[PDB]
Design a protein around this ligand. Structure first.
Ligand code: NAD
Ligand code: NAD
Ligand code: NAD
Ligand code: NAD
Ligand code: DG4
Ligand code: G3H
Ligand code: G3H
Ligand code: G3H
Ligand code: CL
Ligand code: CL
Ligand code: CL
Ligand code: CL
Ligand code: CL
Lengths: 333, 333, 334, 333
């Protein structure tokens, strides 16, 4: 099964298609479901405020997109159980709407004729993959799987390296993160998340994330040992994650940095920098996470030591490269 | 005096209450309708990203707001015909949702028991008031009235002065305008306006407006003589309108400026500046429009002459002061 | 008491110094301003403020002065402090807000220029350094040059002080997510030798050094050498927030931390408390130097290993300025 | 000639090198003058907030950059007199500091041993080239020439087409333009220009431009016929120019757009779109100007007619592609 459907052709959904074409994947996107017309989806695919013009041709008909010459059916079923995935034989659904982030909810795609679902977000207690951290846990019998959040994909490679090298006894994370579509343009009701109701490009906005709390799904030894949250700020994409840890060994910054560099060597998912980059430098990254050695900080008083480690991440395209790596392996199991 | 209900407690709707309290109006707001809980409306009223903390105490119960110790009923009826306006005696509805911009749609407020409706937007061919341009056309028989857009309230006072002093033969308008809630935070579907789908805080976005086309409802002699559009840009509020005119007589810049100054003298609605201000200086303006003599430009070749005149406006609060001026007169009639 | 003040550096901080003094109807009179420009330009900037809106009093100017609320203020343009003619109008205390005299050696030039005392709006080495309502009782009559530290210090210190007093801080690290300022760059281009400072401030998250934690012992001596930290500069015009992750000297709950901080902010004009779901624009114009936010408190514990994260907002412009003015009013009366 | 020096390695200066390399030009940049260290110039060349990572390897020594394996000398002479252009053999100086915008000032580069100078800004009464409008006026005896402003390179192509097809009797433009390094990050003195003292990313800021006033240097028949200004707004690059004209014939929108279409066909400098683009879609443009037929507007009242035509431009990269076109030709004469 190499035929894929995308549910939710938004920021993540459209970049999923862009990245599959970019790596010349064998995967075949045969169908897209969203809430709108092919005309609007085509316009959005062609013109991207964060990544510029689509590198391939885009046209549309009344019920399809034509992308690089190839027809993709377009459906508009707001309930996944009604998506006609069998018409073009979509077997794996990349679930990118945010409305089906649980096993019970994404089961609808299987009731609708698909064989497997890969959810682009945390989805409770199910197989949750950060590629090149725990993708070896994926199994031929898995049918509904999560890639967690962009934040998880940033935190986990760094926490895995520190865990393997030094032990993490306890830690807390703050990500300073680009705003996303769950926020608001102008002050106004946004469900029941009050902070989410506030103008996102005009505020620093505290925001919850399960990235640290649910880390045990990805690194079971760290289960319950991490907590964290986000500060959403006015950049359009490109984010950074700080982890403050008590480690299991006394370290120097050079030692921490060296251990991280070894973990990023020959690692297509986890990059390393000792350059003085800022967030816009991460936009377009092909890594899920880029550890920044320039921000490593060891605070020591007598016997006590706090270790701050920092990694950048393009919460859109970078995370998407991780989603695709996982999808390619998923599709072959 | 009259009791008011507010439909749509959004950017404009909340500022309606703020301005009414600020001027210590005789009008009592007795009921609000929206789509959310009193808790969420209280949070949004108390904390404003553009105008700061609410100047009065704010609390809520399960079915009301308490503002400066006064109770305001809160309803959540998506359909205006279902709002119980009679329960608290709301006589005049300030219609601020965007979903009732016609005589026929806003009739549902009269069906539901109100006497009059003031619509905070263009609403087709009905009486359409820019205070201190044509508010004298209101009379005791009017029951559904429009104050047009923020753009009309910025265009009309300037166009009326030029018309009165020099005549306008033909003109075109461009407003460089703050983004608003009809736009998108991230690239995504926004109805059928393609350009409205693009990230508003990250782009210059061309945007249609009816202010020029429908100016004849406010200034009858200018019917058919003006066109225009908007460029929406990344400022949160505060806007400016340029009008390029062929006038009915030859003029100098000083002459235009003196004529506008006379038109703004003792004019609570229409301000004048010859200071080198920028958009943030108009935020919180108590004028619907402020003419800027520093940007007047006369381009002339032979007997041909283009006149560019420029006025600032706080599309949120400044417009609201005009809406309240009109509401205050509407209620006395 | 000393009542006549001069401002050196009529910038973001210096202009708000005047605004706040008029706001609180201080007996302190600003009689002179020094900067590098014309009265016309200084009057333009005082009248029109992108962050706080129109000046609340009238503003006019002459060729050598500003006229503010009807009161004349002399304007000088001496790039070297030693040349400022402070004695013409009798300016006694200089509020030093240029960023170019951030040491005792540098700022004593104002004394050479005829002033009696200097209050520096920034860290200024190992001199007497005051965070009001943390350690202002250490000011005495012999202090002649004083620092109020940074906006970050005025945010970090009240929170750390309450933690220190209640539970002990054995070690900690701070990250402030902070509004950009004029030390950064509008477009990518050289900005001295800080590489990251060269990058477009309104288009990036930009890591940025601060001394607030490293030098906290000037304000809370028992924490000397126990804290580190840095900043992430982000695209908001003003309004900032500081997170502190601490190992405390006691096992705690979140309610227990929040209650201690609440007690420390009670009857405290410098240090506020909130349990509302606010965002940065809600702190713009704060009359506090720091506002502890109980909704962000987080206790992470594994056995006897405990990390405590406490968070406080601050308006790095106006809120800091209110602390500067508090210290100035006390300074002038010693 | 084939050996270039760059004075002012800023936004334009760095992009000049980027573009020369992108088009595999035979011109080689042999030296750079600025005010800083090779390390900082290397950092800035490698990491670009608007265009992302440099596509070629960058490194430095104490006195040079190494770009794609080639060494480039780096000087830091505040005064062009002192730049040893001689040493490395720098024949043509691309003058991008803003501080030598006259034939008299750029004389210094010739005194220091350069043979020609191309100034990246208006520089008074000298040959001023918009490529594919008037680059044929260049001859082998030219030593110091200007490529005008980004605004001129946007206005001139559109004006030229209209003038050729219809005649422009008089007109005025407004560009809604990305903020640049001449503006302020926070409110504070910026020389004598009051509006330039204001926070550029938080404001709409009126701003003077000479593009229209000086158009006669590029289109001599339009001398003294145009005026205009700018509104600088909070986007980092990517701008748009509106021109309101009285034409010499009556026209329809379709007729205007087909005239512009024809003038842009096989026109490598001047592009055409009828797609609903927004400013970020122009970032990275390889045109000096892109005419947008979706924004054409004809306001007609009897014999009078105002024609609004609109063209997009990447004021950084797009303008640079025009500068390089002119340079390549300038170098061969
Ligand atoms: N933006 C990020 O940085 C990021 C990173 C990683 C993961 N994610 C997660 O991926 C998912 C999508 O994120 P996004 O930023 O692309 O959101 P988005 O709002 O840009 O896209 C959501 C798409 O789903 C469509 N949609 C909504 N409900 C639908 C429904 N019932 N049926 C079909 N289509 C529907 C919408 O029209 C839209 O196109 C979320 O779960 C998000 O948490 C986001
Ligand atoms: N610059 C401005 O924002 C501005 C200026 C002048 C006029 N207007 C016009 O005023 C009106 C509101 O504009 P806004 O910026 O305040 O928009 P908004 O989106 O901020 O507020 C709209 C409010 O109405 C609520 N709402 C939506 N549908 C509803 C319904 N069926 N019933 C009850 N409540 C509903 C929404 O929850 C929201 O609180 C529009 O007509 C707008 O064109 C806006
Ligand atoms: N902006 C903040 O958030 C903040 C908060 C607390 C403390 N501070 C500190 O306050 C001081 C001022 O900061 P700011 O943001 O107001 O900077 P600013 O750049 O806005 O103001 C500096 C002012 O001083 C002028 N100036 C520069 N050199 C001068 C000289 N030799 N003589 C006279 N005037 C000169 C400048 O023209 C300008 O008006 C700095 O030390 C800063 O670290 C800033
Ligand atoms: N930014 C635009 O959109 C744009 C477009 C077209 C033309 N221009 C013009 O091109 C020129 C450069 O504009 P920019 O945006 O790149 O400015 P910039 O501020 O980004 O770059 C100017 C460079 O020149 C350096 N410099 C300043 N003075 C110098 C000196 N005496 N000697 C050597 N180096 C010096 C600076 O360090 C800086 O690196 C200006 O004349 C501008 O009007 C700008
Ligand atoms: O990022 C998130 O991930 P989780 O909250 O952990 O599910 C969300 O908080 C909201 O933003 P997003 O869904 O676009 O990523
Ligand atoms: O829903 C959001 C508002 O309607 C925005 O106002 P607007 O109509 O002026 O764009
Ligand atoms: O605080 C650190 C740096 O000095 C930059 O910020 P500033 O404007 O407060 O001086
Ligand atoms: O140095 C820069 C020039 O003086 C101004 O040109 P600019 O405003 O278009 O960038
Ligand atoms: Cl958590
Ligand atoms: Cl129109
Ligand atoms: Cl000195
Ligand atoms: Cl430190
Ligand atoms: Cl002009």
């Amino acid at each position: 099964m190499s035929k894929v459907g995308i549910n939710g052709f938004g920021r993540i959904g459209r970049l999923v298609l862009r990245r599959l074409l970019e790596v010349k994947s064998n995967i075949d996107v045969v169908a897209i479901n969203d809430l709108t017309s092919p005309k609007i989806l085509a316009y959005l695919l062609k013109h991207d405020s964060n990544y510029g013009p689509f590198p391939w041709s885009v046209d549309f008909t009344e019920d399809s997109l034509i992308v690089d010459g190839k027809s993709i059916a377009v459906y508009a079923e707001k309930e996944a159980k009604n998506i006609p995935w069998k018409a073009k034989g979509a077997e794996i659904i990349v679930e990118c709407t945010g409305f089906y982030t649980s096993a019970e909810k994404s089961q609808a795609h299987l009731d609708a004729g698909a064989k497997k679902v890969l959810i682009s977000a945390p989805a409770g207690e199910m197989k949750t993959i950060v590629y090149n951290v725990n993708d070896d846990t994926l199994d031929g019998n898995d049918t509904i799987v999560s890639v967690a959040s962009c934040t998880t994909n940033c935190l986990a490679p760094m926490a895995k390296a520190l865990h393997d090298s030094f032990g993490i006894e306890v830690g807390t994370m703050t990500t300073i993160a680009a705003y996303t579509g769950t926020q608001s343009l102008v002050d106004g009701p946004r469900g029941k998340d009050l902070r989410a109701s506030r103008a996102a490009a005009e505020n620093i906005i505290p925001h919850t994330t399960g990235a640290a709390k649910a880390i045990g799904l990805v690194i079971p030894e760290l289960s319950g040992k991490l907590k964290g949250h986000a500060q959403r700020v006015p950049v359009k994409t490109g984010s950074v994650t700080e982890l403050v840890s008590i480690l299991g060994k006394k370290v120097t910054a050079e030692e921490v940095n060296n251990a991280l560099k070894q973990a990023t060597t020959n690692n297509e998912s986890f990059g390393y920098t000792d350059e003085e980059i800022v967030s816009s430098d991460i936009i377009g990254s092909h890594f899920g996470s880029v550890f920044d050695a320039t921000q490593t900080e060891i605070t020591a008083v007598g016997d006590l030591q706090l270790v701050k480690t920092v990694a950048w991440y393009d919460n859109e395209y970078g995370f998407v490269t991780q989603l695709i790596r996982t999808l390619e392996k998923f599709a072959k199991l």
